[PDB]
Amino acid sequence: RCCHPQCGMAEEC
Amino acid sequence: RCCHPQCGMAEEC
Amino acid sequence: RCCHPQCGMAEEC
Amino acid sequence: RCCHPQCGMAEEC
Amino acid sequence: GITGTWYNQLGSTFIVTAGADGALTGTYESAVGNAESRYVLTGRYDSAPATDGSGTALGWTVAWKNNYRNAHSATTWSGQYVGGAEARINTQWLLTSGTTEANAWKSTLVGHDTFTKVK
Amino acid sequence: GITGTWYNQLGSTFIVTAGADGALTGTYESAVGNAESRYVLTGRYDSAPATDGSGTALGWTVAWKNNYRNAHSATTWSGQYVGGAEARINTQWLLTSGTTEANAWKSTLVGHDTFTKVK
Amino acid sequence: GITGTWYNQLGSTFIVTAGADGALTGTYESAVGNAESRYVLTGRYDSAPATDGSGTALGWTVAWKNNYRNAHSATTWSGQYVGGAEARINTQWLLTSGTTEANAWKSTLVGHDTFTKVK
Amino acid sequence: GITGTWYNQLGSTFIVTAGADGALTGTYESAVGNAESRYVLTGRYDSAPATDGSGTALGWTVAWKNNYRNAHSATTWSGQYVGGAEARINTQWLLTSGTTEANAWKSTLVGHDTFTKVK
Known part of the structure; x- marks a missing residue:
């Protein structure tokens, strides 16, 4: 769901 | 403690 | 270029 | 007039 | 779902009516609700939000002056x-005070409030 | 001094009427101002500002939905x-979009607009 | 009291060292802490706060680029x-993305985060 | 293009050096720049910005304390x-002051500064 480092992104979208 | 309407002011300071 | 009312949109995108 | 570093204060108030 | 009484974490009460036309009208007051602490509020909201589970965008304004007091802001x-079940209104706000040109740089405060239907 | 037509630096036109009660009512539209680009605006202002040379605090809201379009914000x-002689309304704004819970963290944009009586 | 590991409500981890000179240095990463999700952070804080029970002012920046990814923001x-006992860092943040001149008006997001020493 | 001296419209001078690693280091001072008006600044910037004509994202912090004064913010x-030819750094800022818990709601001011290479 998260695709930006700030929301805790782990894997790239 | 609160002297502005926004912080819930009841009585004037 | 603008697709939101805020930036002055006139023509729909 | 300015008493905080932000507004360019030079002389202390 | 918007019409009704709302409470924030600072001890303030928000009573509003959401019109079919997208209008928000009501009163912003202290927890006590005394006459001198009541202010008119007016705003707008999306009367036809998305149905994909998204929230409903809205906004309102309160000028801090009533028939008893004036905070020039x-x-x-x-x-x-x-x-x-746990409905809420998540907001961020901007408080601007009337200032001289020299103090305009520090005229606006920013914060956030979460309103719920229960105290 | 508030009632009238205002222009920002982004091609938008603000038409407003300031009531004696502190109410602000009007329309926000594009430079052109076609029916599909007009939105209702409502707000409040300090109807009894200080006389020490301070500005007049005010605020207004526009929900981006009309009878033709809806931006859910x-x-x-x-x-x-x-x-x-060079009257102006200096503002800072917050634009919130209706979002899912997962995207709530990036639901609000912040900016600033300066409105003048001349284009 | 500032040096150590902090956690926000979005699933992010903040590891920082507060220097005697007012410097803040550390890393901002995902809950998992994988190498591709770690970013350098630098900031400043008041190394001599008031003793009247007031908080300690601080601030830091993280550019979203590391040796593996770049979000141009x-x-x-x-x-x-x-x-x-329940120490915390209460903040408000601004996220700016590199944009063209035409999109500059929507280049900045605003929000708030509360960091605690416990998940 | 970032390294150098910058001036805002409030009489402040920003002297900064942009490292190849994405680091921003320097000093923030008044128009004059006396020892008592100089403060340390640290930040980060995108060292590999897009090439589509987009701006370069950046940010920095200044704690208002030096060897002579402390504004606890x-x-x-x-x-x-x-x-x-007309290079500039367009920003929005947040100024937080150390406050008691009771005044935390009004601890943060928001504004905007535009820096240029010429006064």
Whole structure:
């Protein structure tokens, strides 16, 4: 769901 | 403690 | 270029 | 007039 | 779902009526609700939000002057309403005070409020 | 001094009427101003500002929905009116979009607009 | 009291060292802490706060680029540290993305984060 | 294009060095620049910005304490650098003061600064 480092992104979208 | 309407002011300071 | 009312949109995108 | 570093204060108030 | 009484974490009460036309009208007051602490509020909201589970965008303004007091300032709240068992209105606000040109740089405060239907 | 037509630096036109009660009512539209680009605006202002040369605090909201389009968002402008030969309304705004819970963290944009009586 | 590991409500981890000179240095990463999700952070804080029970003002910046990824944006957090059994850092942040001139008006997001020493 | 001296419209001078690693280091001072008006600044920027004509995201922090004065506050600037004949850094900032828990709601001011290479 998260695709930006700030929301805790782990894997790239 | 609160002297502005926004912080819930009841009585004037 | 603008697709939101805020930036002055006139023509729909 | 300015008493905080932000507004360019030079002389202390 | 928006019409009704709302409470924030600072001890303030928000009573509002959401019109079919997208209008928000009501009163912003202290927890006590005394006459001198009541202020008129007016705003707008999305009367036809998305149905994909998204919140409902809205915003309102309160100028801090009534028939008893005047704080020469106004606050605007911008946010969204989320329905459900634990409905809430999540907002961020801007409080601007009337200032001289020299003090204009520090005329606006920013913050956030979460309103719920229960105290 | 507030009632009238205002222009920002982004091609938008603000038409407003300031009531004696502190109410702000009007329309926010594009440079052209076609029916599909007009939105209702409502707000409040300090109807009895200080007389020490301070500005007049005010704020208003526009929900981006009309009878033709819906952007599922709302913007609130907070600022102050400064009179004179070069009258202006200096504001900071918050634009919130209706989002899912997962995207709530990136639901609000912040910016600033300066409105003048001349284009 | 500031040096150590902090956690926000979005699933992010903040590891920082507060220098005697007012410097803040560390890493901002995902809950997992994988190498591709770690970013350098730098900031400043009041190394001699008031003793009247007030918080400690601070701020830091993280540009969203590391040796593996680049999101062409940067976030700054501004807030204060409050010590005690339930210590926390209350902040408000601004996330700016590199944009063209035409999209500059929507280049900045605003929000708030509360960091605690416990998940 | 970032390294160098910058001036805002409030009489402040920003001297900074942009490292190849994405680091921003320097000093923030008044128009004059006396020892008592100089403060340390630290930040980060996108060292590999897009090449589609987008700006360069950046941010920095200044804690308002030096060896002579302490305002128990810190400001963070978030924005982007735009090159060219008329190079500029457009920012929005947040100034947080250390406060008691009771005054935490009014601890943060928001504003905007535009920096240029010429006074």
